[PDB]
């Protein structure tokens, strides 16, 4: 009989049962979306949108609901922190419910299409055999894809009839769902411009409508029909797998690098924001502006929002996790409770010192403190036989401005070294570790997990393209080569490789 | 809730093992 790896091939020339298994697959994907959303809602903590947002809690499908307009629960709470908001039916629970009902309906339609496989629609009226006009099917499906793309751009995202999409400030402090006008200039190709996403969907939907019309009306050339084996559904499988891995590589990239469609309030910050000190530079700009207005150091550092200081922490970088460090980031360092404030380290001679920050590459990092002109003035030594710059030897004190430790000064080298190790990780935060029994190693955010899954699937789907492309183009020899093939493959007999009419006879 | 730590694995195996036995015996029927 069939080998185990060829069982699904029974539907290959069975369009009714092919629809059935497609329906069953869709039922399963919709049911997964509903059940995953219900599990996330069963465990989501909505009490603190600042220091415990969704990307600290391992929320995977909640940001995708939040991205397109569903921001609110039935049970009161919004992911934007707002309360008292009426979503109507289309809360997170309503969306999850709808996917569960859709999944049930698609399961029932799968059952019908399995039992009632032998519909006359699926048979060529010329012959008696089952036949699918794949080019006409493509035209219909491309037309409808174009209509849905255009409608999602023109009505949903613009707010003409729809909610719009999640937009935010560049530092992820004021994220909310709003209508977005399309951007028809070259700035529509800025990936951080949401108006570019709206323009895309209007223009690509229009182009999809036009290309659908062409493909509904114009038959393929005979050269392209025979070249791409357009009477074989496996050619559609090969090219569709190819487009699907292209799209998966793209979504992995825009998740990892950042995009208007991957906001940091929904998926967490990127590793490149920690790499370049994106948030550090803004916090310092803001403090410097307040110092230039005339404020004191404590006054200037107290105006930094806790959310902004939370973005400037290496445990929120997605490049700090592990493959088998599972779950929420709260299972790592803990649930963040408060910002401890900004440390300033000063030596005995009153040189301000900054602790060198831990890069994303390093599981561990030495504690180094440099002055304004880049000279190492203090460190924590490994070998203390010939130490010259120990915190104890250089008399380093630390004073905190803003946050929980505002106005405090620490002079005990135990506390100063502990705050130095905290300053290695960026802004310091107090963490509750006993709620989730946090083990003390960093996890990656939903941003890193999405990128991994989709990068790996895209790479595996390259094999699938090559396999199914090969099986399409080499279908005549799939069970083996012709029993002759002796004179055709010999060297020099024919002028052209494999062409029987080009024999030299020399 | 402070449930038994072995409760989940006991429940899944207590269901799954005879389910597997019945499915094995059903699918091979007609041999």
């Amino acid at each position: 009989g069939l080998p185990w790896y060829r069982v699904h091939t029974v539907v290959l020339n069975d369009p009714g049962r092919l629809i059935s298994v497609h329906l069953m697959h869709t039922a399963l994907v919709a049911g997964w979306a509903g059940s995953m959303a219900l599990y996330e809602l069963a465990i989501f903590d909505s009490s603190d949108a600042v220091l415990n947002p969704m990307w600290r809690q391992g929320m995977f499908v909640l940001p995708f609901m939040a991205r397109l307009g569903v921001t609110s629960s039935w049970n009161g709470w919004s992911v934007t922190g707002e309360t008292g908001l009426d979503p109507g039916f289309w809360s997170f629970e309503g969306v999850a419910a709808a996917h569960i009902v859709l999944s049930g309906l698609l399961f029932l339609a799968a059952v019908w299409h399995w039992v009632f496989w032998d519909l006359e629609l699926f048979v060529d009226p010329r012959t008696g055999e089952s036949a699918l006009d794949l080019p006409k099917m493509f035209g219909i499906h491309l037309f409808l894809s174009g209509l849905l793309c255009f409608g999602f751009g023109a009505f949903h995202l613009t707010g003409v009839w729809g909610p719009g999409m999640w937009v935010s400030d560049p530092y992820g402090l004021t994220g909310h769902v709003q209508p977005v006008a399309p951007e028809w200039g070259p700035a529509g190709f800025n990936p951080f411009n949401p108006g570019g996403v709206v323009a895309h969907h209007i223009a690509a939907g229009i182009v999809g409508i036009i290309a659908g019309l062409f493909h509904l009306t114009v038959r393929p050339p005979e050269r392209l029909y025979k070249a791409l084996r357009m009477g074989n559904i496996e050619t559609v499988l090969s090219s569709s797998i190819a487009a699907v891995f292209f799209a998966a590589f793209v979504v992995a990239g825009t998740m990892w690098y950042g995009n208007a469609t991957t906001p940091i309030e929904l998926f967490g910050p990127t590793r490149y924001q920690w790499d370049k000190g994106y948030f550090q530079e803004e916090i310092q700009r803001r403090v410097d502006s307040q110092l230039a207005e005339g404020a004191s150091l404590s006054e200037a550092w107290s105006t930094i929002p806790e959310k902004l200081a939370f973005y400037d922490y290496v445990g929120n970088s997605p490049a700090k996790g592990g493959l088998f460090r599972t779950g929420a980031m709260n299972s790592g360092d803990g649930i963040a409770q408060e910002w401890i404030g900004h440390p300033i380290f000063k030596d005995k001679e009153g040189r301000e010192l900054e602790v060198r920050r831990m890069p994303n590459f390093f599981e561990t990092f030495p504690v180094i403190m440099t002055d304004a002109d880049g000279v190492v003035r203090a460190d924590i030594p490994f070998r203390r036989s010939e130490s010259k710059f120990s915190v104890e030897q250089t008399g380093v004190t630390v004073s905190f401005y803003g946050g929980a430790l505002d106005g405090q000064t620490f002079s005990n080298p135990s506390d100063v070294k502990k705050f130095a190790r905290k300053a290695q990780l960026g802004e310091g935060f107090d963490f509750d570790t006993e709620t989730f029994n946090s083990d003390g190693v960093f996890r990656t955010s939903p941003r890193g997990w999405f990128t991994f899954g989709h990068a790996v699937f895209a790479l595996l789907f390259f094999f699938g393209h090559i396999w199914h492309g090969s099986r399409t183009l080499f279908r005549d020899v799939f069970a083996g080569v012709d029993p002759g093939l002796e004179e055709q493959v010999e060297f020099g007999v024919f002028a052209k490789v494999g062409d029987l009419s080009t024999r030299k006879e020399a | 809730m402070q449930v038994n730590n072995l409760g989940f694995i006991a429940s899944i195996l207590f269901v799954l093992v005879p389910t597997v036995f019945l499915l094995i015996l059903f699918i091979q029927t007609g041999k």
Binding site: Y39, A42, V111 | M1, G7, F8, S11, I12, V15
Partner: peptide
């Protein structure tokens, strides 16, 4: 998380009811 196990066993029972009705062995007179 014990709720997941309860939902799973109840769902398995209901699914067995669906398959036992809709895809029963059909009674035939022979």
């Amino acid at each position: 998380m014990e709720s997941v196990a309860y939902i799973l066993v109840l769902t398995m029972a209901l699914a067995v009811l669906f398959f036992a009705i809709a895809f029963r062995e059909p009674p035939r007179i022979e």
